[PDB]
Write a protein that binds this ligand. Structure first.
Ligand SMILES: Nc1nc2c(ncn2[C@@H]2O[C@H](COP(=O)(O)OP(=O)(O)O)[C@@H](O)[C@H]2O)c(=O)[nH]1
Ligand SMILES: O=P(O)(O)OC[C@H]1O[C@@H](n2cnc3c(OP(=O)(O)O)ncnc32)[C@H](O)[C@@H]1O
Ligand SMILES: O=CN(O)CC(=O)O
Ligand SMILES: [Mg+2]
Length: 431
C-alpha cells in the first residue's frame, strides 16, 4: 500500500523508530501524528545510535521529508535542542523537516503543571515522562492552548500567552502551592526561535492529500503504544492522545479511508514504563534476564522498564482497535538461551471466569490473572540473523503460535538493534 502506518501494539518501546527508519528507504514522507517528546525512538545504523523524541524517524534519510502532524504536541525548546544535536552530526534537519501550524505548543508552565499534578497524586502517580504532554493536550481541548500558527503574529501571541499564563500561575501558586512560571521568560525564550519554527510550516493535510493522489509512499510513525491510548488504554494510566490507528487521521489530516496498511510493532516479551496494569509482569529471575538482555531502559527518561511475557490477550485488543494488517516481531534475539518461553492466551478474572478479552479502565484489571501456554525456548543465537532458515525450530514455532493466537501474519522479524539485523518476509509497501 502507499500509506503505511507503523505503531506500538503494547505499551510503547516495541521498536517503532528502528522499523520506521528501516522501511523509509522507499518513502517520500514520514509523519508523526500524536504524542510529543515523551517518545524515545532508537535508531542504530552501522552501530551509530540516534534516539529521537519529537523529530520523526525518517530524518536520517535525505530522500524523505519528515513531517510533524497537527496531532503532535510540540515543544519549541525540545525541538531546537534535538535540531542542534542532529545538525552537529551532519543531519540538515531544517532542510528535511516540515510541521503543522495546528500543533499545540508545549511551554514551560505545562511542565510545572505536570510536576505539580504528579506530586499531588503521591503514591497514585501516573509516572509521566515529566514533559507537559497532558497539560498541553488539556489546553488544546480547553480552547486556550497556543499553536504554532499563533507564532505568526507576535503581539497577538503575547496577549494570548499572558492570559493563559495568568490562568496557569494562579492555580500553580494558590491551588498547588507551587512556584509560578515567569511570563516574560517564556515569551522571550519562545520568541527567540519563533522564526525557525515558522519557517517549517506547511499545510500538512493538503500535502498528504496531494502526496496521496500522486501515489507517493507515505509512512506514519506512531508514538507510545496501544494500551496507552487516552480512550482505549488503561485509563488513567495512559498518555493523553490516541495512540491507536485512529490517531493517524485525526493527527495528520489524511482521510481515514487512505490507510492502506497498518503494521503492528510487536516486541516478543512485554515491557511497560510508568504505573499501570501489567498482567504478565515478571518480578523473578527471568524478568531481570529480560531487562538486562534487552537493555530495557527508557530511551527518554532512563528509568528501568517493567518486563514480562508476551500477552496475547492484550495484543489481540490491539489487532482489532488498529485493524492490523501485519506484525513486526522485534527483540526475538533477546529470548536466546531461555529454557522455555510462555505467552498469555487468556485471563482469569477475579470472579473465576476465564476470558480472552481485556478489561478497559485500570481499575478493571485489578485482580486479573494470566493463563499461559508454555513453549520450549532455544539455545541457538538468533541475533543478527536475517533469514528464517537461521532461526531454530522452537523460534519458528513460537512465531507460528503467535500468528495462530492472533490471526495476523508476522510480516517482518527483528533480530537486533541495527537497521540491517532484520528479515522482511513481506514489505508493507508492496502489500
Ligand atoms: N536486540 C534487539 N534490540 C532491538 C531490536 N529492535 C530494536 N532494538 C532496540 O530495542 C529498543 C527499542 O526501544 P525504543 O527505541 O524505546 O523503542 P521505540 O520507542 O518503539 O522506538 C532500542 O534499544 C532499540 O535500539 C531487536 O530486534 N533486537
Ligand atoms: O504523559 P506522558 O509523559 O506521555 O506519560 C504518560 C505515560 O505513558 C508512558 N509513556 C509515554 N511515552 C512513552 C513511550 O514512548 P515511545 O514508545 O514512543 O518511545 N514509551 C513507553 N511509555 C511511554 C509514561 O511512562 C507514562 O506511563
Ligand atoms: O522511549 C521512551 N519511553 O521509554 C519513555 C520513558 O523513557 O519513560
Ligand atoms: Mg521508546
Amino acid at each position: 500500500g502507499n500509506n503505511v502506518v507503523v505503531l506500538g501494539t503494547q505499551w510503547g518501546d516495541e521498536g517503532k523508530g528502528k522499523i520506521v527508519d528501516l522501511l523509509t528507504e522507499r518513502a517520500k514522507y514520514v509523519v508523526r501524528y500524536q504524542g510529543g517528546h515523551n517518545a524515545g525512538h532508537t535508531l542504530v545504523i552501522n552501530g551509530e545510535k540516534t534516539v529521537l523524541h519529537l523529530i520523526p524517524s525518517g530524518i536520517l534519510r535525505e530522500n524523505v521529508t519528515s513531517i510533524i502532524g497537527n496531532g503532535v504536541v510540540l515543544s519549541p525548546a525540545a525541538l531546537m535542542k534535538e535540531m542542534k544535536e542532529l545538525e552537529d552530526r551532519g543531519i540538515p534537519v531544517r532542510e528535511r523537516l516540515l510541521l503543522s501550524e495546528a500543533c499545540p505548543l508545549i511551554l514551560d508552565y505545562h511542565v510545572a503543571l505536570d510536576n505539580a499534578r504528579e506530586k499531588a497524586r503521591g503514591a497514585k502517580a501516573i509516572g509521566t515522562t515529566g514533559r507537559g504532554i497532558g497539560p498541553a493536550y488539556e489546553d488544546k481541548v480547553a480552547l486556550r492552548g497556543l499553536r504554532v500558527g499563533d507564532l505568526f503574529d507576535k503581539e497577538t501571541f503575547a496577549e494570548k500567552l499572558k492570559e493563559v499564563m495568568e490562568y496557569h500561575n494562579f492555580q500553580l501558586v494558590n491551588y498547588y502551592k507551587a512556584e509560578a512560571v515567569d511570563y516574560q521568560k517564556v515569551l522571550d525564550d519562545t520568541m527567540a526561535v519563533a522564526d525557525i519554527l515558522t519557517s517549517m510550516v506547511v499545510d500538512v493535510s493538503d500535502l498528504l492529500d496531494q502526496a496521496r493522489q500522486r501515489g507517493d509512499f507515505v509512512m506514519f510513525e506512531g508514538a507510545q503504544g496501544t494500551l496507552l491510548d487516552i480512550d482505549h488504554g488503561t485509563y488513567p494510566y495512559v498518555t493523553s492522545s490516541n495512540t491507536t490507528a485512529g490517531g493517524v487521521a485525526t493527527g495528520s489530516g489524511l482521510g481515514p479511508r487512505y490507510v492502506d496498511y497498518v503494521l503492528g510493532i510487536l516486541k516478543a516479551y512485554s515491557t511497560r514504563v510508568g504505573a499501570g496494569p501489567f498482567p504478565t509482569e515478571l518480578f523473578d529471575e527471568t524478568g531481570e534476564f529480560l531487562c538486562k538482555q534487552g537493555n530495557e531502559f527508557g530511551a527518554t527518561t532512563g528509568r528501568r522498564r517493567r518486563t514480562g511475557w508476551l500477552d496475547t490477550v492484550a495484543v489481540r485488543r490491539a489487532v482489532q482497535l488498529n485493524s492490523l494488517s501485519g506484525f513486526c516481531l522485534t527483540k526475538l534475539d533477546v529470548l536466546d538461551g531461555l529454557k522455555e518461553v510462555k505467552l498469555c492466551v487468556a485471563y482469569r478474572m477475579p470472579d473465576g471466569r476465564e476470558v480472552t478479552t481485556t478489561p478497559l479502565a485500570a481499575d478493571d484489571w485489578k485482580g486479573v490473572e494470566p493463563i499461559y501456554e508454555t513453549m520450549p525456548g532455544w539455545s541457538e543465537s538468533t541475533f543478527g540473523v536475517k533469514d528464517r532458515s537461521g532461526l531454530p525450530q522452537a523460534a519458528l514455532n513460537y512465531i507460528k503460535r503467535i500468528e495462530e493466537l492472533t490471526g495476523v501474519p508476522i510480516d517482518i522479524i527483528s533480530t537486533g538493534p541495527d537497521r540491517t539485523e532484520t528479515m522482511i518476509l513481506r514489505d508493507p509497501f508492496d502489500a
